Design a protein around this ligand. Structure first.
Ligand code: HEM
Ligand code: HEM
Lengths: 444, 449
């Protein structure tokens, strides 16, 4: 008999998710109930996994495949059959996967590096231009950077977020749409539908317009590869409708999780001054030029360790879903039937004391001193297998470049003694996180 | 710009400076005179010894430097082969064995080894409990009995039974003679006078090979919780390949060498500093009595011995028992903004001098103060390197520190120690460091096991 949290009569466990912080509530349930517990809703059953012992079996692609959770099903209403919201057996997943994978390689980052520096310089210039006693709204500025970076590197579109306060009309529709998708998980609603469809049209209208605009001009961006790339398997290119879904997918997935990572990384740095000093030291020693090169970013070994430890404690895409391909027994004790669903609670996996030791809550980038020392399937901030994050190298290159430049150019002060408050949408971010930056007066 | 260099001997350059019984300590004295970097030239060899954290932090940049096999390690390779410690990073068998063996060496994997560690530690305590009045302890001798038997039992389920002997195992007779010959060959041509040295050297290699490959063939098919199991059954996730039997023998020899000698030196130096600093010993003995409340220490209790762990780190600061490692420049690069290096140029990290960097540690670098390690994260990057650097760092670091903390904790729980001879520190140099002739008296506290 599998552990299961408290129930609400006919609603079963569903009201447990009627909260602003469902991931963190699920983590507390995992602390109480252990490596696996069942979660029941009206017409829905799933099992949350928290231990490396069970998650390593769940990551066996011969036994389990990616499932679309209820959140992803609602995102699919505007993300379509993009890479993140399509089933593995759908023709358009493997097609887009083969077409888009060469545009996301570590090798392909060399072409994106210049445009990444463009936005990163804007962030540094904004902070250099602050007056005395002014402070920085960290997740707000990190979102300005990651959104503009994926806009420029992806489709040569400048959201110009550092010129605004009210964000782009596309971005306003996106957050409202994602909010509606989250609310339907916790959920008079006739107005919500009119709002939801208006936000979908706004995203579709801008995207489909840029697709038609892109003339025949060639750029160093994702749009070029999508318009001209052919799947080696089927020999087919993506049609314009799926291209639009990929644009929406990459605009969503390409910015918010990365901004959360940078925000959490800076949080842990100002809360652990010895780690900050080590990271600032490497940045000063490695970033010897006014503009960082691609090779210099790859040299920021310790900064990359800081980001991985931030991804360990607070993975900004905190869960993914799987389904059993056939009848199977997980870990030798809980039999599963074909189609049974599993949820991987990534933050709990990253706190497995049998893997990481007893000090799992401490921020120690030195855990990632040797990448090979980490056991298999113990660290999964970017998902698993062929359905893993295609943009992993993009996010980590952008985050290493930006965090390196931040540490090179400024000293940071946790002037409010900020108390960590993690806002949950479908991703995680430290709400209200603010710092002061004292410029080191190093020119660009 | 112009690099310092110690005195030369004509055509022999600096080589006769290493024609001594204590070369590491001679190099440390040279570093005191010449500073953070000096050139060392020999016939057909050039290297640069680094002593400051300022330069060593650059040398530890794995994008600019990779582990080099020093001349000593090249001679050890004649019987350690392409084991982990004597292989190049670019050799297929390094990354293969590296990926296969890391899961048996984590701090988590120590839980499985803990019981066998207690087995040997109890034998040590029982030996000292059974000494008669006025009898004394030969500290490095007994510490080596412990570390060898521990690496024998947790590693390959083999009992060297060192506490039942005076004359050590024929494998060790082969091993120490082999290490001595490898050290001696640094001064040497291949003329006829050395034919007997070669004949002796090959006899010692065969003894080690004969014992090891026999146990490999013996391991029956029985399953054990040891290193040998992972080597026989483990597969590299990258290549999908397991280690072949020839490399497995090199890993066993490597683990027998590297798994006991540096750790015994650590315990010997730690006990040395404890009896020379009675206030530190009392503080460490108090923690042992407060934490080790059971007749046998648990794995979690050993992790609680925070001050004992600080004592061991400070012992590793002053006398790191693997006192140097070698690096080579991957490409042309400039060290410290003043010393240009070409691709393939060699560096030696003089760890004991790095650990005496006054800009890092303060002016009292020679004093034994475990409180330096109250918060280990306060230490700057690449300032404390007793276990090497990067992907070529000591794989057995967690093994050595768990064994040493467990044993030293039990020693401090069960005995009071007296420096009855007022021992004068005499550091014997093989390829590792140990305090030769260090003896103490133990007065039992009469706490049963
Ligand atoms: C630190 C930042 C990021 C994190 C933590 C992250 C996390 C993840 C995770 C956990 C998954 C698997 C989800 C599942 O199995 O349901 C995933 C998939 C995906 N991510 Fe990310 N991601 C990040 C950045 C990015 C970026 C920058 C992009 C776009 C450039 C991106 C695009 C995608 C796509 C397209 C998929 C679906 C892949 C497929 O199934 O074909 N991600 N991501
Ligand atoms: C206090 C005790 C120890 C010290 C001070 C120490 C020190 C070191 C150092 C400095 C290196 C790097 C050598 C180089 O870069 O050329 C190293 C590597 C190594 N050590 Fe240790 N060690 C200790 C204990 C152990 C133990 C107990 C084991 C086995 C269980 C072990 C096995 C190894 C191996 C296999 C390597 C090579 C790692 C590689 O390159 O893949 N050592 N050690």
């Amino acid at each position: 008999e599998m552990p299961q949290p408290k129930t609400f009569g006919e609603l079963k466990n569903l009201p447990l998710l009627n909260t602003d912080k469902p991931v963190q509530a699920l983590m507390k349930i995992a602390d109480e109930l252990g490596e696996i517990f069942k979660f029941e809703a009206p017409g829905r059953v799933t099992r949350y996994l928290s231990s490396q012992r069970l998650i390593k079996e769940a990551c066996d692609e011969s036994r389990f495949d990616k499932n679309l959770s209820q959140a992803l099903k609602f995102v699919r209403d505007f993300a379509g059959d993009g890479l993140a919201t399509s089933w593995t057996h759908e023709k358009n997943w493997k097609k887009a996967h083969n077409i888009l994978l060469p545009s996301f390689s570590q090798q392909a980052m060399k072409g994106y590096h210049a445009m990444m520096v463009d936005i990163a310089v804007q962030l540094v210039q904004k902070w250099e231009r602050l007056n005395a006693d002014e402070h920085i709204e960290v997740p707000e500025d990190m979102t300005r950077l990651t959104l503009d970076t994926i806009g420029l590197c992806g489709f040569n579109y400048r959201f110009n977020s550092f010129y605004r306060d009210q964000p782009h009309p596309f971005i306003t529709s996106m957050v409202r749409a994602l909010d509606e998708a989250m609310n339907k998980l916790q959920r008079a609603y006739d107005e919500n539908k009119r709002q939801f469809q208006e936000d979908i049209k706004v995203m579709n209208d801008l995207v489909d317009k840029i697709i038609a605009d892109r003339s025949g001009e060639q750029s160093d961006d994702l749009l070029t590869h999508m318009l001209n790339g052919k799947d080696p398997e089927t020999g087919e290119p993506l049609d314009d409708e799926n291209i639009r879904y990929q644009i929406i997918t990459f605009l969503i997935a390409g910015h918010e999780t990365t901004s959360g990572l940078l925000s959490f990384a800076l949080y842990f740095l100002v809360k652990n001054p010895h780690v900050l000093q080590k990271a600032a030291e490497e940045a000063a020693r490695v970033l010897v030029d006014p503009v960082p090169s691609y090779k210099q970013v790859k040299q920021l070994k310790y900064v990359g360790m800081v980001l991985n430890e931030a991804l360990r404690l607070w993975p900004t895409a905190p869960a993914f879903s799987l389904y059993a391909k056939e009848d199977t027994v997980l870990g030798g004790e809980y039999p599963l039937e074909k189609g049974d669903e599993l949820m991987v609670l990534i933050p709990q996996l990253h706190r497995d004391k049998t893997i990481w030791g007893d000090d799992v809550e401490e921020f120690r980038p030195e855990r990632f001193e040797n990448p090979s020392a980490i056991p298999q399937h113990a660290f999964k901030p970017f998902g698993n297998g062929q359905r893993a994050c295609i943009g992993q190298q993009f996010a980590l290159h952008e985050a290493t470049l930006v965090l390196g430049m931040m540490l090179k150019h400024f000293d940071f002060e946790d002037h409010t003694n900020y108390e960590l408050d993690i806002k949950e949408t479908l991703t995680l971010k430290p709400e209200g996180f603010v710092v002061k930056a004292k410029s080191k007066k190093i020119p660009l």
